Amino acid sequence: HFRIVVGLGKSGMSLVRYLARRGLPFAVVDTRENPPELATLRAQYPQVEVRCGELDAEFLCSARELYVSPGLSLRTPALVQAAAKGVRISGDIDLFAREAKAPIVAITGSNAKSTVTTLVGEMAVAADKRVAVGGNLGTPALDLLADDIELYVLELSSFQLETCDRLNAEVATVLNVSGMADYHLAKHRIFRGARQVVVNRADALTRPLIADTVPCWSFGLNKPDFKAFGLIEEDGQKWLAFQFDKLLPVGELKIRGAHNYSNALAALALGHAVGLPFDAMLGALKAFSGLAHRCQWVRERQGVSYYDDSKATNVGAALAAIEGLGADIDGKLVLLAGGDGKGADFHDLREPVARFCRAVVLLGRDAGLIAQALGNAVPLVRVATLDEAVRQAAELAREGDAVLLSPACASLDMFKNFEERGRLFAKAVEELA
Numbered sequence: 001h002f003r004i005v006v007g008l009g010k011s012g013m014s015l016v017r018y019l020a021r022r023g024l025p026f027a028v029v030d031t032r033e034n035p036p037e038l039a040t041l042r043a044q045y046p047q048v049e050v051r052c053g054e055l056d057a058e059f060l061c062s063a064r065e066l067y068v069s070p071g072l073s074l075r076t077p078a079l080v081q082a083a084a085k086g087v088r089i090s091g092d093i094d095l096f097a098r099e100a101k102a103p104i105v106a107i108t109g110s111n112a113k114s115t116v117t118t119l120v121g122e123m124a125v126a127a128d129k130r131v132a133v134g135g136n137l138g139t140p141a142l143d144l145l146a147d148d149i150e151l152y153v154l155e156l157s158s159f160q161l162e163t164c165d166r167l168n169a170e171v172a173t174v175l176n177v178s179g180m181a182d183y184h185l186a187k188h189r190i191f192r193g194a195r196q197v198v199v200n201r202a203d204a205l206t207r208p209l210i211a212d213t214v215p216c217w218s219f220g221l222n223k224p225d226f227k228a229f230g231l232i233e234e235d236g237q238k239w240l241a242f243q244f245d246k247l248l249p250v251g252e253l254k255i256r257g258a259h260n261y262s263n264a265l266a267a268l269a270l271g272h273a274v275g276l277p278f279d280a281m282l283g284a285l286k287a288f289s290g291l292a293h294r295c296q297w298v299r300e301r302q303g304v305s306y307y308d309d310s311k312a313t314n315v316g317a318a319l320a321a322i323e324g325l326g327a328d329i330d331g332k333l334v335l336l337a338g339g340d341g342k343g344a345d346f347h348d349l350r351e352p353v354a355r356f357c358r359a360v361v362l363l364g365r366d367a368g369l370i371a372q373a374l375g376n377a378v379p380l381v382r383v384a385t386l387d388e389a390v391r392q393a394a395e396l397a398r399e400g401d402a403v404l405l406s407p408a409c410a411s412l413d414m415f416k417n418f419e420e421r422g423r424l425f426a427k428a429v430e431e432l433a
Contacts, residue, residue: 002062004029006055006079007069008037011092014140015067018095020045027063029055031072057081067091070159091163093156096141104152105270106167106194108187109175112263115255116175117155119267119288124151127280136160151274158186168193171217171273175266177205198269201228202262217273219265221258229265229272240265240285242272248282254289254297256307256402257324293422295321295406298429303399306429309406310422315344318408319352326356331400333357334393336425338364339409346373349408353378359396361389365413386414386421390428403429 005015008030019026027049028041034052041050051059055078060066065088068079074089083089097104107117117133124131132144135154144152154169161167172194174187184205191197191208199207201220217227224230224241231250232241239246240253240261247268250261264285271281290296298306307325312318318337326333333356337349350373353360359379362370367382374380379396383389393403411421 001064002026003065003067004060004063006060006066007072008032008035008041008050009069009071011140012069013037014142015092015095016041016045016048018092018142018145020048027051029059031055055079060087061085063087065090067095068163070157070163074162089163090165091160092140092142093135093154093160093164093167096145096154097164097167099142099145100152100168101147102149102152103170103274104154104167105274106154106156106169106172106190107175107270108156108158108161108190109173112175112259113155114291115260115263116173116267116270117153118291119264119285120270121153122288123267123271123276123281123284124153124274126284127276129276156190158183161189162186164189164192166193169195171196171198171270173198173266173270174206174208175263176200176203178203196273198266198273200262200266201230215273217269219262219269221262221265229269231261231265240268242268242278247278248285252286254286256295256297257328259324260290293419295325295404296422298426299432301394301429301432304394304397304401304403306403306426307405308422308425309404310411310418310425312406312408313339313410313418314342315346315348315408318406319348321404321406322349322352322356325402325404326352329400329402331358331398331402334359334361334397334401334403336361336363336389336393336403336405337370337407337409338362338367339407339411339421340364340413341366341369341409344408346370346408350374358398358401359393361393361396363389363414364407364409364411366409370408386424387428387431390425391432394432 003026005012005028029051057078060082067090107113121133129150130148131151132149133153134144135141136157172190177184196215197211198217201218219229221231229242232239232246238250240248293308293311296308298308309321335357362382381392397403405425411418415421
């Protein structure tokens with residue numbers, strides 16, 4: 001029967017391409033008045049009606065089925081009236097789930113899902129599989145469909161799972177949970193029809209009831225047991241481990257901190273469940289420097305490692321990296337910070353800096369402001385350029401320390417965006433003698 005695309009974004013346009021190539025009659029609605037895709041849609045799909053305006057329950061009831069974009073609230077009045085008359089409320093992921101003829105790795109959770117999703121993708125690439133990665137913010141799932149594909153890796157948001165009826169994922173995981181009942185019930189739908197699950201030993205709420213009847217792999221930071229990825233501590237070294245077997249000393253990883261070890265172990269668990277070899281996975285794990293500008297490893301020079309965390313444009317993001325990297329390393333931190341502070345209260349940085357920093361290097365407009373908030377009990381130096389800051393940190397860092405650009409400020413006083421700031425930080429580091 002008839003179908004309607006409800007919402008015209010990146011996912012909506014993928015629904016336009018999918019329904020058109022399959023030869024199915026459909027129409028499109030959007031609450032805007034000159035949406036961007038309107039010029040392309042009038043030129044490339046001239047036979048499709050595009051109804052721009054406030055949603056009308058009357059118009060939607062001419063469809064037996066609707067595909068709602070993740071942004072829109074499922075409690076929008078027109079959508080509630082349409083489901084009462086019997087319209088099936090669906091979405092791109094629900095169509096993808098019915099059309100896939102290859103296993104699906106399905107990942108949902110907090111912001112941490114980007115590292116795990118990216119890792120499993122690079123692991124599968126290292127294993128010579130034809131793999132498509134998408135979902136959530138990323139390539140729309142329906143665009144990934146192809147008959148040569150051997151493995152789908154999907155980062156799914158709570159909204160995308162709300163309109164999904166039965167995903168039939170080969171392995172599925174909710175990375176972490178800990179009110180907010182609706183958020184976690186939606187995420188939990190990722191387990192509908194799942195043939196394997198990966199659970200977090202640190203968070204009992206990520207374990208679905210089906211873990212008692214389907215293969216259940218776990219990850220965590222303590223010592224692993226049957227079907228578990230964990231940490232073994234033998235001699236003075238911590239090792240990533242599977243069951244009784246030591247896989248790799250964490251010191252050979254480029255990423256740092258407890259959260260990254262857990263993300264690495266979850267990615268090992270997910271990749272294992274789909275038969276990725278350990279040798280391929282561990283090599284990819286060793287080569288992964290991190291996400292662009294999220295505490296990203298740049299270089300090791302004379303036993304000092306340099307980390308680009310330029311995305312930390314606020315106090316909260318920088319405190320997380322100061323405590324995350326500081327608790328993990330053997331030495332101490334040399335922090336580079338400063339820029340546009342947005343009037344933030346920098347007081348929250350004093351104690352972690354006193355506990356983890358050997359010195360602080362300050363640049364940017366609000367460098368004097370951060371200085372007064374840190375006090376006169378940590379060694380401070382104020383510089384004018386990023387290259388001065390990098391060389392000044394290298395003159396302060398002793399072996400085993402970490403040089404951390406976690407500015408806690410925006411970069412627009414001296415740079416184009418934070419990404420150019422991190423890119424130029426890496427350049428100054430790569431140019432040290």
